[PDB]
Design an enzyme around this catalytic site. Structure first.
Site, short mmCIF file in Angstrom:
data_model
loop_
_atom_site.label_atom_id
_atom_site.label_comp_id
_atom_site.label_asym_id
_atom_site.label_seq_id
_atom_site.Cartn_x
_atom_site.Cartn_y
_atom_site.Cartn_z
CB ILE A 99 38.20 35.44 29.44
CG1 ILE A 99 37.75 34.08 28.90
CG2 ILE A 99 36.99 36.32 29.68
CD1 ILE A 99 36.61 33.48 29.69
N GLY A 100 39.69 37.89 30.04
CA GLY A 100 39.86 39.28 30.45
C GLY A 100 40.35 39.37 31.88
N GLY A 135 40.46 42.27 35.54
CA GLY A 135 39.59 43.12 36.32
C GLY A 135 40.03 43.24 37.76
CB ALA A 136 38.69 41.69 40.87
N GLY A 148 43.16 40.30 38.60
CA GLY A 148 43.21 38.91 38.23
C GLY A 148 42.83 38.64 36.79
CB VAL A 194 39.05 35.82 33.72
CG1 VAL A 194 38.09 34.65 33.48
CG2 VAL A 194 38.76 36.47 35.05
CE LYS A 214 37.29 35.01 40.37
NZ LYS A 214 35.83 35.35 40.38
CG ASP A 239 30.40 45.91 42.92
OD1 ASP A 239 29.88 47.00 42.58
OD2 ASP A 239 31.52 45.55 42.52
N1 LIG Z 1 32.78 32.18 34.62
C1 LIG Z 1 33.01 33.12 33.54
N2 LIG Z 1 32.68 32.83 32.29
C2 LIG Z 1 32.89 33.68 31.30
N3 LIG Z 1 33.45 34.86 31.52
C3 LIG Z 1 33.82 35.23 32.76
C4 LIG Z 1 33.61 34.37 33.81
C5 LIG Z 1 34.09 35.01 34.97
I1 LIG Z 1 34.08 34.22 36.95
C6 LIG Z 1 34.58 36.25 34.57
N4 LIG Z 1 34.40 36.37 33.25
C7 LIG Z 1 34.77 37.51 32.42
O1 LIG Z 1 35.60 38.59 33.34
C8 LIG Z 1 34.90 39.66 33.31
C9 LIG Z 1 33.78 39.67 34.39
O2 LIG Z 1 32.65 40.30 33.84
C10 LIG Z 1 34.30 39.56 31.86
O3 LIG Z 1 35.27 39.67 30.91
C11 LIG Z 1 33.72 38.15 31.93
O4 LIG Z 1 33.30 37.65 30.57
#
Ligand SMILES: Nc1ncnc2c1c(I)cn2[C@@H]1O[C@H](CO)[C@@H](O)[C@H]1O
Ligand SMILES: Cc1ccc(-n2nnc3c(=O)n(CC(=O)NCc4ccc5c(c4)OCO5)cnc32)cc1C
EC number: 2.7.11.24
Length: 350
Positions: free
Chosen positions: A22-23, A25-26, A28, A30, A45, A140
């Protein structure tokens, strides 16, 4: 071996498999994954916080809060995976409901109708009502921390900066460091506040409402002080009474040192917006944090009249409490506490 994604081990098997990026960020990655027990794709995550003492603070407070909360508009923790010993524990995997997008991504590819904006705002405030009823501050809020799906359900995530409110200790000096996202910071963050009161989250929601109305951040500061100049770029220079409320003279004189700015009227900024939405926006984006609208008053505003319903807006059992705080504890003691806090998910246990 252990499954992995983009040259990085995601050691969540065998329960969670068929991963997919997915992606990040913090600190970590995902991924989504298939939960072979519950037979549904989930989000996972990966978090590696144990090198840095602050990352440990953010991880522990998030886990602790999200395990205690239960609300439709707040992301939950379904499972936590980590090594069985602790010196082996280098990573923590937090399993959560899989959402489809977030408001940040959505606003990049869509102008929202007023009906959509009204409904998203309601859900944000419904979630916030629950958090604040626990005396917890998110601190935040921003579009990328609002997860969404095509059915328009919304969940607040990322409680890494969340704290129990503390108005008594809100006072701090002019120009104090801050970790939360610049564009969504209330003006008093740059003046005399550490962001320990509920008004800090309301400001952020007002920023998000403005962004939904126009697909543009309302206050895109480039640096710390510049952020405050943008805010005054819309609100105008503070009133006499509002200037006085500010305690320490350093911040008070900085404000005096600024050129006078004319207040840009809301309906000049957003000429096509619902006038009820602009009235609520005005009350959320008020300079003086004591005059800023509260979450229940915002829910009860005429703009949200088709949704406001206290009988369908859960509140918390009672105020949340941290038995002892985490800003002094060394990162090794924090790892321990993260360990015990996650033990309930270890296979076995009683
Ligand atoms: N539970 C989820 N379902 C879908 N996407 C998630 C999450 C979570 I926790 C984080 N993200 C994705 O990581 C980034 C947070 O905006 C974005 O990339 C966000 O899409
Ligand atoms: C370009 C583009 C533009 C637009 C859209 N969409 N998508 N969904 C919608 C949609 O629902 N409405 C109508 C509306 O106001 N619904 C509110 C509501 C939805 C569920 C509820 C609810 C209220 O109360 C409980 O459950 C309008 N426009 C939409 C999609 C694309 C791709």
């Amino acid at each position: 071996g252990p499954e992995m994604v983009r040259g990085q081990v995601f050691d969540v098997g065998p329960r969670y498999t068929n991963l997919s990026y997915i992606g990040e960020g913090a600190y970590g990655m995902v991924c989504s994954a298939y939960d072979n027990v519950n037979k549904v794709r989930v989000a996972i995550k990966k978090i590696s916080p144990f090198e840095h003492q602050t990352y440990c603070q953010r991880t522990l407070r998030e886990i602790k809060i999200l395990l205690r909360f239960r609300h439709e508009n707040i992301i939950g923790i379904n499972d936590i995976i980590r090594a069985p010993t602790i010196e082996q524990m280098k990573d923590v995997y937090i399993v959560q409901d899989l959402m489809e997008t977030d408001l940040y991504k959505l606003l990049k590819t869509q102008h929202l109708s007023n009906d959509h904006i009204c409904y998203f705002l309601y859900q944000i405030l419904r979630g916030l009502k629950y958090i604040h009823s626990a005396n917890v501050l998110h601190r935040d809020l921003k579009p990328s921390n609002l997860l969404l799906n095509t059915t328009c359900d919304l969940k607040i995530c990322d409680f890494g900066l969340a704290r129990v409110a503390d108005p008594d200790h809100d006072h701090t000096g002019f120009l104090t460091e801050y970790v939360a996202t610049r564009w969504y910071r209330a003006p008093e963050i740059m003046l005399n506040s550490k962001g320990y009161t509920k008004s800090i989250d309301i400001w952020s929601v007002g920023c998000i409402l403005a962004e939904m109305l126009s697909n543009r951040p309302i206050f895109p500061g480039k640096h710390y002080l510049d952020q405050l100049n943008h805010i005054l770029g819309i609100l105008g220079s503070p009133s006499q009474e509002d200037l006085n409320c500010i305690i320490n003279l350093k911040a008070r004189n900085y404000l005096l040192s600024l050129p006078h700015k004319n207040k840009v009227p809301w309906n000049r900024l957003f000429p096509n917006a619902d006038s009820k939405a602009l009235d609520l926006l005005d009350k959320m984006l008020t300079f003086n944090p004591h005059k800023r609208i509260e979450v229940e008053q915002a829910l009860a505003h005429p703009y949200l009249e088709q949704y406001y319903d206290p009988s369908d807006e859960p509140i918390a059992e009672a105020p949340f409490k941290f038995d002892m705080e985490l800003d002094d504890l060394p990162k090794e003691k924090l790892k321990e506490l993260i360990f015990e806090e996650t033990a309930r998910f270890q296979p076995g246990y009683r």
